[PDB]
Design a protein around this nucleic acid. Structure first.
Ligand SMILES: Nc1ncnc2c1ncn2[C@@H]1O[C@H](COP(=O)(O)OP(=O)(O)OP(=O)(O)O)[C@@H](O)[C@H]1O
Ligand SMILES: [Mg+2]
Ligand SMILES: [Zn+2]
Lengths: 48, 235, 226
RNA sequence: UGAGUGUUUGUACCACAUGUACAGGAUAGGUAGGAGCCGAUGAGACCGGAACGCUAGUUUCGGAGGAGGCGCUGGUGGGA
């Protein structure tokens, strides 16, 4: 089962990126290092 | 206790889907469901340990007495008395209060306002949990389930499954709670011990939610039965 | 069942009518038939429930007319604070070593006050004070940087008020010796401090019932507005 | 579109009764006052009846009698 997800910056809680993931292959909430335009620096973004 | 549009999904396997429930006060609610249905998970939501993915779970401000399905032994060397004493926050506040006095001596005129307020609350909170409990707990064992005092000085990890259940149940009562959340309170108890638990729960004036797989035990106490469905993910 | 003096006092009082402050104090003075300098006390039944941490209240209020009974003062200090107590003329002035003597000695002192630093050392003895309730508390003001203010307040008749478990708080305003006007002024001071102490989370009417009573007499209900 | 009766009920006063964990003298509900309090307006002790009761005592009504007790005080207990 593949579904679209939103990645939110853990620092400013800004819903920054849109992506998708296969729930079966990645049961746990995805986490990436992505640029946060509000803070203008790379930060940890976690799926909500 | 009320929950609306409850949603919770661990990975790919979901627990609640748009579930709802309203429990009136002073209701001895019997929670029933197959293993894995999500009965323990409901309490975790009430205790705010878990958060619903979507929806609102509403709990009253009253103090809650929680009896975990599994015994929580923080350290192997913990004694039964230490385990029971941890039920009340007397020891924790005193350690904080003792530190507050230390800070007062070090700091002269900077943090006194903050320290004085913290000291006052601890004293008022300490008196609310009357420090006379040291004697009451010692005798709560006698009147509760005939728990011998030799066990009182023995490591908790060395007790038998039935003995551990008695200690954990007494700890919940020792805390003097307002709402009782009992998760299989008679898992290992023998026939004689179950009688005391049943009588106490019949007499208990407050609200008590019971997760139990013992039909006969529930029937003597329960007035409202809450069924957690495993296939419909509803309540 | 009821003494004749109490019966006549009851007939004087009107249970249905909640008197004004002036009528209530005068009526209480009339009702205390017992021929001793009884202390007049006021009891407020607050809507707040103590079981909530914020709701409970515990403080101290100074009465310009006083309580009508002098209050012995015990002070714990060291150095300039000790000199402050001596200048204030505190009934008893002590230190960390003298706390042990105070335990079992000089007892019956009405109030106990300790400096912020002395509290740490005092705390050991204070656990014994706890059940007695003498232990100084910052909220009541017993713990202050200056003991002279505490001593003068105690002499004037400062009274510490603490809400009981049921939500009723009692305090003596003065002796039947004090004139009814002085007693009413003391009641007003008590009323003002309680209103200022009303907690934020409280709701509805703040006081469910206000009753003034002498040690011998029965209760008299007093109008809240008065 | 108004009268009553009765029943089962929820609320709110007013009457009452109960408060036994441990130790403690013992049936200790909490807080405030409390050195004085109560009794020929019939006290103590005593007899019975009744209620409670954790069976230890508690509370209460009556019968006689007629003036005493209780408290502070004392140690216990967190609390007298
Ligand atoms: N963090 C988690 N990660 C993955 N799955 C989980 C997690 N938490 C719970 N689950 C699943 O939730 C399901 C139901 O939760 P819960 O443990 O409360 O069931 P239960 O009814 O209390 O079990 P029992 O009645 O037998 O004690 C479990 O089967 C469990 O597998
Ligand atoms: Mg479970
Ligand atoms: Zn950010």
């Amino acid at each position: 089962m593949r579904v679209n997800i939103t990645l939110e910056c853990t620092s400013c809680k800004e819903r920054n990126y849109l992506t998708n993931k296969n729930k079966r292959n990645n049961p746990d909430r995805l986490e990436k290092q992505k640029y946060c335009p509000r803070e203008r620096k790379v930060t940890l973004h976690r799926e909500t | 206790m009320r929950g609306q549009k409850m949603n919770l999904t661990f990975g790919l396997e979901e627990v609640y889907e748009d579930a709802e429930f309203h429990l009136g006060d002073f209701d001895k609610v019997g929670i029933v469901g197959v293993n894995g249905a999500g009965k323990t998970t409901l309490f975790r939501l009430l205790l705010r340990e878990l958060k619903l993915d979507k929806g609102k779970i509403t709990i009253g401000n009253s103090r809650i007495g929680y009896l975990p399905q599994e015994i929580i032994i923080m350290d192997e060397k913990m004694t039964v008395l230490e385990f029971l004493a941890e039920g009340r926050p007397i020891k924790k506040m005193e350690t904080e209060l003792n530190y507050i006095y230390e800070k007062l001596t070090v700091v002269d005129d900077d943090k006194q306002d903050r320290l004085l307020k913290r000291m006052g609350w601890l004293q008022e909170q300490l008196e609310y949990f009357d420090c006379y409990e040291a004697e009451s707990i010692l005798l709560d064992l006698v009147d509760s389930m005939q728990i011998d005092f030799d066990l009182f000085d023995q490591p908790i990890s060395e007790l038998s499954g039935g003995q551990k259940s008695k200690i954990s149940f007494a700890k919940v009562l020792y805390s003097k709670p307002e709402i009782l959340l009992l998760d299989q309170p008679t898992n290992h108890l023998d026939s004689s011990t179950k009688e005391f638990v049943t009588k106490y729960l019949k007499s208990y004036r407050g609200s008590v939610l019971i997760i139990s797989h013992d039909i006969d035990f529930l029937n003597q106490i329960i007035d409202k039965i809450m069924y957690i469905d495993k296939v419909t993910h509803k309540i | 069942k009821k003494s004749k003096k109490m019966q006549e006092a009851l007939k004087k009082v009107d249970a249905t009518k909640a008197y004004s402050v002036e009528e209530a104090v005068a009526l209480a003075k009339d009702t205390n038939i017992a021929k001793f300098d009884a202390t007049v006390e006021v009891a407020y039944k607050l809507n707040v429930d103590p079981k909530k941490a914020d709701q409970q209240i515990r403080g101290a209020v100074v009465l310009p007319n006083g309580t009508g009974k002098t209050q012995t003062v015990l002070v714990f200090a060291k150095g300039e604070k000790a000199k402050e107590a001596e200048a204030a003329g505190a009934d008893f002035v002590g230190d960390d070593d003298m706390v042990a003597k105070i335990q079992g000695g000089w007892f019956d002192f009405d109030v106990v006050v300790a400096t912020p630093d002395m509290m740490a050392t005092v705390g050991k003895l204070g656990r014994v004070l706890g059940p007695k309730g003498l232990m100084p508390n910052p909220k009541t003001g017993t713990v202050t940087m200056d003991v002279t203010k505490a001593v003068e307040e105690v002499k004037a008749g400062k009274v510490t008020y603490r809400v009981d478990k049921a939500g009723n708080i009692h305090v003596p305003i003065g002796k039947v010796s004090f004139d009814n006007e002085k007693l009413v002024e003391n009641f007003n001071t008590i009323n003002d401090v309680l209103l200022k102490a009303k907690p934020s989370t409280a709701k509805g009417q703040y006081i469910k019932n206000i009753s003034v009573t002498t040690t011998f007499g029965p209760g008299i209900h007093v109008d809240q507005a008065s």
